[PDB]
Amino acid sequence: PEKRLLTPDDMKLWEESPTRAHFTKFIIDLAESVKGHENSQYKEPISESINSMMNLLSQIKDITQKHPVIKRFGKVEFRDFYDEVSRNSRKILRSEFPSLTDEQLEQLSIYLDESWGNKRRIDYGSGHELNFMCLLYGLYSYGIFNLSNDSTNLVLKVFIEYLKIMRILETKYWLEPAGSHGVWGLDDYHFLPFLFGAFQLTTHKHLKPISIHNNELVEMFAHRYLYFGCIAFINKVKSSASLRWHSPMLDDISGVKTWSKVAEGMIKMYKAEVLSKLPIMQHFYFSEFLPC
């Protein structure tokens, strides 16, 4: 028994709520944990839960390679993919997290299932990346993750790995952008990369938001800074066409004096344009670890 429940000023009962406050806080703790760290500055002895989390991602990674495009917009084999995760997620989690009761698995599995896109629409958006985080927040809130010893590693090992998988799905199956931000959404599929990415560069004595226009910087830090990775990805797609053509929020953001002001904007923006969009939020699952 856990599901979604939202409409018109159910949403007013959303910002006010202590869940929003708890969860919002969590994602910030994660953003700042990572506040001056390149993609591979992990915090020391990589805590054992983090490994298990990574080797559950590899299992998912594996499951995509069992499903080849054998047959425009949206490639149906993805539903074959989704169907696999949908029917193993309980089995998968139990294997990597033997601590977890029958009943907690019930609460987690659903999020794992919806982390990767829609079976019916063959698409992905902010809501899906958000589900993942909800999962990750659930693990944490069941004692599977220690905020101090993990935090940084949740972002650098777990989320970046996740993003790597999305990038394979996205390319392999031609997942449609969930496109439920107007025209001033950052990117076809993703938000949090930019968010975290910006925490990463707050501290940099040399990259400036204007930098994402400089192609040599972009490929030099592609695999080293989330935010540049994304830009590098974008640059494939909109070959030798300017960035505005592709995404004028991004274009506008690059005009901001510092990474530091950018990151703050990015939080106001997430608070406002993800966690208060009826369209997104009414597809977000409440659960015992996320009440309402």
Q: Retrieve residue 31's tokens.
A: 């953003």
Q: What is the sign of the dihedral through the CA atoms of 243, 28, 147 and 192?
A: negative
State whether 279 and 217 are in the same domain. Answer: yes
* Method by which the coordinates were obtained: X-ray
Contact at 8 Å (CB) between 280 and 191? no
State whether 233 and 91 are in the same domain. Answer: no
H or E, element range at 124 = strand 123-124
State whether 142 and 196 are in the same domain. Answer: no
Taking the C-alpha atoms of residue 133 and residue 47, their distance in angstroms, rounded to an integer, is 19
State whether 179 and 190 are in the same domain. Answer: no
State whether 39 and 161 are in the same domain. Answer: yes
State whether 230 and 240 are in the same domain. Answer: yes
State whether 60 and 138 are in the same domain. Answer: yes
CB atoms within 10 A of CB 66: 9
State whether 167 and 256 are in the same domain. Answer: no
User: How does 10-20 read in b/e, with b if 16+ C-beta sit within 10 Å?
Assistant: ebeebeeeeeb
Host domain of residue 264: 186-292
State whether 156 and 63 are in the same domain. Answer: yes
State whether 222 and 180 are in the same domain. Answer: no
The stretches of 43-177 forming alpha helices (DSSP H) are 48-64, 77-96, 102-113, 126-141, 147-153, 160-173
Structural domain count, the chain = 2
Domain edge (last residue) among 139, 166, 185? 185
State whether 137 and 191 are in the same domain. Answer: no
Domain edge (last residue) among 152, 168, 185? 185
Taking the C-alpha atoms of residue 210 and residue 200, their distance in angstroms, rounded to an integer, is 16
Resolution of the coordinates, Å: 2.8
* Burial of residue 68 (number of CB atoms within 10 Å: 0-12, 13-18, 19+): exposed
State whether 106 and 212 are in the same domain. Answer: no
Domain edge (last residue) among 185, 211, 240? 185
